[PDB]
Amino acid sequence: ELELDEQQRKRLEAFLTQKQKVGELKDDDFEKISELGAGNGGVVFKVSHKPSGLVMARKLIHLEIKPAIRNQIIRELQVLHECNSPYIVGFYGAFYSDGEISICMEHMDGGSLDQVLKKAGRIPEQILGKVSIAVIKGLTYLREKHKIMHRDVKPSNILVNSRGEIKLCDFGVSGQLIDSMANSFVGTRSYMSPERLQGTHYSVQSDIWSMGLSLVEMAVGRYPIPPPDAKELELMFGCPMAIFELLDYIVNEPPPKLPSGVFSLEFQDFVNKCLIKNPAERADLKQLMVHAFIKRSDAEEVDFAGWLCSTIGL
Ligand SMILES: Nc1ncnc2c1ncn2[C@@H]1O[C@H](COP(=O)(O)OP(=O)(O)O)[C@@H](O)[C@H]1O
Ligand SMILES: N#CC(=C(/N)Sc1ccccc1N)/C(C#N)=C(\N)Sc1ccccc1N
Ligand SMILES: [Ca+2]
Ligand SMILES: [Mg+2]
Ligand code: NA
C-alpha cells in the first residue's frame, strides 16, 4: 500500500529536483527567519538557504563532542538521502559547526500536531482518520525501506502543512545520535509503551501504542493518563502526577480509552487495538491498514488542508 498517487509522485519529484540544486551545506549559507520551537535536544529554526533561496527547517543540536563523534553522526544521517516518502519529512543534509550538529529538513508550515491541538482544543475524528493513515504508512515505509522503527511517535513528532500533508519526523535513524543523546536525556517517556518501560518488548508494535495514545490525546484534548473523571468528561464534551508516577501507572494500570457516545465504535475499536498492553495481542501495521476505521477513513473525502488552515489561522 506504499503506492504513490499522481499528485504525491509529482511532489516527491519536485522535492528531489530542488534538493539536487543544493550543494554542500554550510553554516554561513543560512539566514534565520524564525524560531520554530525548542527541545531538550536542540532548537529548530525556519531558515533560508541563501544560495538556493530554499526555505528549510534547521535543527541545531548543541554538542561539544569530539570532531570524531559528530562525523559519525553526519555519516549515519546520510542514509536519509534515499528516504523519500510522502509520509516522512524531507531531508536536505547535515553538518557540524561552532560546536553543534545541524540538521536541515523540509519545512512544514503547519507545525506539529501538539501545536495544532493547542489551537484546536480537540481534533475531529475524521481528521484523526487521515492522521492515522499517514502515521501507519510512515511507519510502514520506515520499516520496509529502511528496516527501522520510529522509536519516538508523539504529537510533536507529527508535522503537517498547508498542502494537507502529514509527515513523521525525528525518527531514530542514527544509533550514535540516539546514544550521544540517550546519554544525557530530556525527551519525554510519557508516550512509551508498557513493554519499553519494562525493558521487555521493543519493536514496531511499540510505535503503534504511542500512536494510539497520541490519537486519544488529540481526540479528547488532553494527555489521557490518568483517565479523566465524570466531571472532566461532562466539561470536555458537555455530556498532579510526577513523571515517574505516570510511567508506573502506564505499566501497571489498564490502558486509556476514548469516551463512549462521542466517537464512532470503529474509532474506539481502532485505538483499543493500538493500546493493548501485550505487544503480541496488540494489532500490527498490516492489521491496522485494513482496520474498519482505516478503510472508512481512507474512503472519506476530507479536506485536511482546509480544516487545518481554518484552525490555526493560515
Ligand atoms: N520540519 C519542521 N517544520 C516545521 N516545524 C518543525 C519542524 N521540525 C520541528 N519543528 C518544530 O520544532 C519543535 C521542536 O522540535 P524538537 O527539537 O524535536 O522538540 P520536540 O520534542 O517538541 O519535537 C517541534 O515541536 C516542532 O513544532
Ligand atoms: N536520528 C535521529 C533523530 C532523532 N531525534 S534520534 C531519536 C529518535 C527516536 C528516539 C530517541 C532518539 N534519540 C533526528 C534528530 N534530531 C532526526 N531524524 S533528524 C530528521 C531527519 C530527516 C527528517 C526529519 C528529521 N527530524
Ligand atoms: Ca559561521
Ligand atoms: Mg521532535
Ligand atoms: Na552559525
CB 151 within 8 A of CB 44: no
Among candidate residues 204, 197, 87, the one with its CA nearest the CA of residue 141: 87
The response to whether 154 counts as a known ligand-binding position is yes
Contact (CB, 8 A) for 92 and 79: no
Which atom of ligand 2 has the smallest separation from the CA of 182? Answer: 13
Supply the angle between the helices 265-274 and 204-220 in degrees, to the nearest 10.
Answer: 140
**What residue's CA is closest to ligand 2, atom 13?**
178
Resolution expressed in Å: 2.0
**Distance in angstroms (rounded) separating the CA atoms of residues 235 and 175:** 44
Annotation: CATH topology of 110-314: Transferase(Phosphotransferase); domain 1 (1.10.510)
Q: How many CB atoms lie within 10 A of CB 62?
A: 11
The domain spans of the chain are 1-109, 110-314
Considering 5, 27, 28, 152, which one is annotated as catalytic?
152
**CA 218 remoteness from chain centre:** 13
Asked if residue 114 belongs to a known ligand binding site, the reply is yes
**122 alpha carbon – ligand 1 mean position (Å):** 20
Give me the count of residues in the chain: 314
DSSP 30-86: EEEEEEEEE-SS-EEEEEEETTTTEEEEEEEE-----HHHHHHHHHHHGGGGG---T
DSSP 96: E
Cα(24) to centroid(ligand 3), Å: 14
Asked if residue 187 lies in contact with residue 178, where contact means CB atoms within 8 angstroms, the answer is no
Residue where the block lists cell 519529512: 89
Distance between Cα 173 and ligand 2 center (Å)? 6
Q: Could you tell me the CATH superfamily of domain 1-109?
A: Phosphorylase Kinase; domain 1 (3.30.200.20)
3-state SS, residue 112 = strand
Neighbours of 295 (CB within 10 A): 12
User: What would the grid cell of residue 5 be?
Assistant: 498517487
